[PDB]
């Protein structure tokens, strides 16, 4: 299977430079072009450029010609995209895509790059214990509160990905303090609260922090 794995989300200061990596697997690295596409929050797709992994030829779009530099490492089947003179307006999700079938047939997961003068901040995870009066028949709601982190994003899984039924990770809210907070809740059978173990796995790549918080019955 063709897979394109990108580097994690990061905070960058204005004027700095960042290099996003894209490791290619499942296909011959030197047989296909590689594209880069950026998408600002709530905006459309913007093509950035294309690289030929065999000889290293690059061609960038007009908007990004003065600040983007794309390289590649054939030994590791990895394409790099460097954005210099970073600015607040560069905050976006950056994708690599394989240039098969004369289009962009396989995409990476995307890398959310935030440009800000504020520093990164790890999250504070608190349990949301399932209450008794808040239950709904045979189902109960329990979750984790991920408070006061910067920047986005954070990924929440339950039982290391072994629990996906009923899981709902809500979008984050931007507080007046400039920090984000969100909640992830899984609907669980109300009778298996005492037997089943419920762990929320919170990952904040920009701070290089992972928290596995255990949610107990109240």
């Amino acid at each position: 299977e063709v897979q394109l794995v990108q580097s994690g989300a990061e905070v960058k200061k204005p004027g700095a430079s960042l290099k996003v990596s894209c490791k290619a697997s499942g296909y011959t690295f030197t047989d296909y072009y590689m594209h880069w596409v950026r998408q600002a929050p709530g905006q459309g797709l913007e093509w950035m450029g294309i690289i030929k992994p065999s000889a290293g030829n690059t061609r960038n779009a007009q908007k990004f010609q003065g600040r983007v530099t794309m390289t590649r490492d054939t030994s590791t089947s990895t394409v790099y995209m460097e954005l210099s003179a970073l600015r607040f307006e560069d905050t976006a999700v950056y994708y690599c895509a394989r240039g098969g079938v004369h289009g962009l047939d396989y995409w990476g997961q995307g890398t959310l790059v935030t440009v800000s003068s504020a520093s990164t901040k790890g999250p504070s995870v608190f349990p949301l214990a399932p209450s008794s009066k808040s239950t709904s028949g045979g189902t109960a709601a329990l979750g984790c509160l991920v408070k006061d982190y910067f920047p986005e994003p954070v990924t929440v899984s339950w039982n290391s990905g072994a629990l996906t039924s009923g899981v709902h990770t809500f979008p984050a809210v931007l507080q007046s303090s400039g920090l984000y907070s969100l909640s992830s809740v899984v609907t669980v059978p109300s009778s298996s609260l005492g037997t089943q173990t419920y762990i929320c796995n919170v990952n904040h790549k920009p701070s290089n922090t992972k928290v596995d918080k255990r949610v107990e019955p109240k």
Binding site: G44, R59, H102, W107, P127
Partner: protein, 213 residues
């Protein structure tokens, strides 16, 4: 985006056919391969159509693409709620020497059943209270249409400060999700008898209350 012109939105009742046109010129569409891309809410873009009419594996046959002259068209038969997403037209422009995407076209299915919101309110955790903080978490989910208003009350009086509410967000099952947070100090939490989260949706209100006890 400017060289490729897409409609901002297309709509059709469930089970009907929708059509998205992508208009360009001889420099891009009239002479180069056209591809279409689908972006489900909260997901990365994926290839829907390549080489103007070919479907990769995993794409339902309800999706169809074609090209005529300097325009390309994406067709979706039997429109289901799972097709609601942003659709992008893409091709190569020989004048610019660049790959170009059209502006997003949002597909919306009309006549969707009304969903009354489900409200779940969490009191501050003991861990947070031991950490000199307190936050009330009100979670609203499975509502349609996606317009909710949240009101908070200390006992029976409104609270305006410390209230942060998200914009309604599209869930994966379509429908909608929202969350509202009320930030308190541990003093104000234990000092009151009850705190309330009221959610108004389509002229009807669902209210849940929690108490320090």
């Amino acid at each position: 985006q400017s060289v490729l012109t897409q409609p901002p939105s297309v709509s059709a009742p469930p089970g009907q056919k929708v059509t998205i046109s992508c208009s360009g010129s001889s420099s891009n569409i009239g002479n180069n391969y056209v591809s279409w891309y689908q972006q489900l809410p909260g997901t990365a873009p994926k290839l829907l159509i390549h080489e103007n009419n070919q479907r990769p594996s995993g794409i339902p046959d309800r999706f169809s693409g074609s090209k005529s002259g300097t325009s390309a068209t994406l067709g979706i038969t039997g429109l289901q709620t799972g097709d609601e997403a942003d659709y992008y037209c893409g091709t190569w422009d020989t004048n610019l020497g660049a790959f170009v995407f059209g502006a997003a076209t949002r597909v919306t299915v009309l006549g969707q059943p009304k969903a009354n919101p489900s409200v779940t309110l969490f009191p501050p955790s003991s861990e947070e209270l031991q950490a000199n903080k307190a936050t009330l978490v009100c979670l609203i989910s499975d509502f349609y249409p996606g317009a909710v208003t949240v009101a908070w009350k200390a006992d029976s009086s409104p609270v305006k400060a410390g209230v942060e509410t998200t914009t309604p967000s599209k869930q994966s099952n379509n429908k909608y999700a929202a969350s509202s947070y009320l930030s308190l100090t541990p003093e104000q939490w234990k000092s009151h008898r009850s705190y309330s989260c009221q959610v108004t949706h389509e002229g009807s209100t669902v209210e849940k209350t929690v108490a320090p006890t």
